């Protein structure tokens, strides 16, 4: 074998396909439809996360708060990996059956489709390998945490430390000291960035959320909770965003 | 006499009593408590709604600009005012939310939020400290309702930046009006300035508060009255997370 066994790992514990389950033309129902996606790709990030070497390994309210901080960003990076692959980043894959292009109009809601659309984008200018990606993800789901640590900061340090060790890896598997040193700068770079994106789209969400019965879009239940009890918090700056370069 | 004439207007226009409304007759529950805070907190932003339409320069912004200097400063309005209260009918040792919801501590540490009324207790003993006037108060209330504004500015930015001015300019006079001396004056300028700087962490922590009791309100059995629903609804996210221009007088 020349792929490295934790890739590999991580290969085999991604997520099958996740359906919106849309009417194959409203910002209410696109809205409701893009819900019930965030429903389905939180309880898809959470098995996964039972998979995931390391993590079950921390402490559960560590686990939780991890899930919790990373759930925007772990679905606007996986959207930018599928429109990359799917649909050469010129529409949002956000699921098979709720592909937006050529937009699907005027408004908010599609000024934050734009502010998505920078990830794809970027995964086609750079040429991201799958690879690269699966280290990445890992990487996001554990790029934030509370002001005072978490519970499991040592467990926690090791983890991280490994699966920056494997996206070196995962850069060392296409050349040359200065290349593979430049691409690390400028995946890891990639993520920093990710925090200012996020930010816009948990304002969004927040907003959209507690204007919700007069706006008629339906948030799921376990969604709704994350959005309930970490948002605010979140945009408030009461959590440690980490940032590989100062 | 030597009260500067947009001082005196300012305290002719300042609002009457208003009252919570709340039943002291039985116990302290958290969801009767803010509740009755809620009351309280709708019949103030009327009267901040109503002030506002007599305030010097105020109704000449754009409408938009009016509604969203009014939906930004409310909380910090509020506890300036309860500041203020507490300090004058209560010599500043309990809170004085209303002439019919008053918090001694022991009140306090007997609610839900007691270190919400710790915070907000900070105001009224710095008016104590710095033995605070009534006069540099209803400038600097006046400076709270314009101390923020929208990262793309204002539509009516110019007349803002002149209005705001004017009143810095009155708050200086009020000064003088005790103050005497260079030295003194302008030292105490720099502490009154700081102190309204400085309300925008201790109003940061109060926002979250309010937006986390907003959200979770039905398991708490704590109604949001109209009004006050539509200002937290409008902008409490956005100020939370940053996307706002918090002015300072200091760096
Ligand atoms: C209110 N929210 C909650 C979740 C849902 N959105 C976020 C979204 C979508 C479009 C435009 C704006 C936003 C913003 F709120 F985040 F800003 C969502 C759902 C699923 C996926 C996937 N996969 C993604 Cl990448 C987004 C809408
Ligand atoms: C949920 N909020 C919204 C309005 C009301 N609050 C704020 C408050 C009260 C107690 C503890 C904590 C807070 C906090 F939300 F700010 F934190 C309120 C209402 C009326 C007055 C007056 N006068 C005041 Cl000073 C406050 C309760």
């Given amino acids: 074998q020349l792929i490295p066994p934790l890739i590999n790992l991580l290969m085999s514990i991604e997520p099958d396909v996740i359906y919106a389950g849309h009417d194959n033309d409203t910002s209410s129902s696109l809205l409701t439809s893009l819900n019930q ?3 389905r790709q939180l309880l898809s990030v959470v098995k996964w996360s039972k998979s995931l070497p390391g993590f079950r390994n921390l402490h ?16 606007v990076f996986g959207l930018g990996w599928r429109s990359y692959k799917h649909v050469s980043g010129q529409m949002l894959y956000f699921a098979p059956d709720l592909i937006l292009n050529e937009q699907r109009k005027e408004s908010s809601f599609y000024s934050l489709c734009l502010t998505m659309w920078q990830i794809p984008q970027e995964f086609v200018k750079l040429q991201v ?4 990606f699966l280290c990445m993800k890992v990487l996001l789901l554990l790029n934030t945490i509370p002001l005072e640590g978490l519970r499991s900061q040592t467990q926690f340090e090791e983890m991280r430390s ?4 494997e996206l070196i890896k995962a850069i060392g598997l296409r050349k040359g000291v200065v290349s593979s040193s430049q691409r690390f ?3 890891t770079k990639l993520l ?3 925090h200012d994106l996020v930010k816009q789209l948990h304002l969004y969400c927040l907003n959209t959320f507690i204007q919700s019965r007069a706006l008629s879009v339906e948030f799921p239940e376990m969604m709704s909770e994350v959005i309930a ?3 605010p918090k979140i945009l408030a700056g009461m959590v440690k965003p980490l940032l590989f370069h100062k």
Avoid: K, P
């Avoid at 939780?64 to 772990?74: K, V």
């Avoid at 390998?129 to 690269?132: C, G, K, M, N, R």
């Fill in 37 to 39: 996606l965030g429903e």
């Fill in 60 to 75: 559960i309210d560590d686990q939780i708060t991890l899930i919790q901080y990373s759930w925007m960003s772990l679905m």
């Fill in 129 to 132: 390998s799958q690879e690269e």
């Fill in 162 to 165: 490994s699966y920056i060790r």
């Fill in 185 to 187: 700068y400028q995946l």
């Fill in 192 to 194: 920093d960035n990710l």
């Fill in 229 to 231: 009890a970490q948002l």
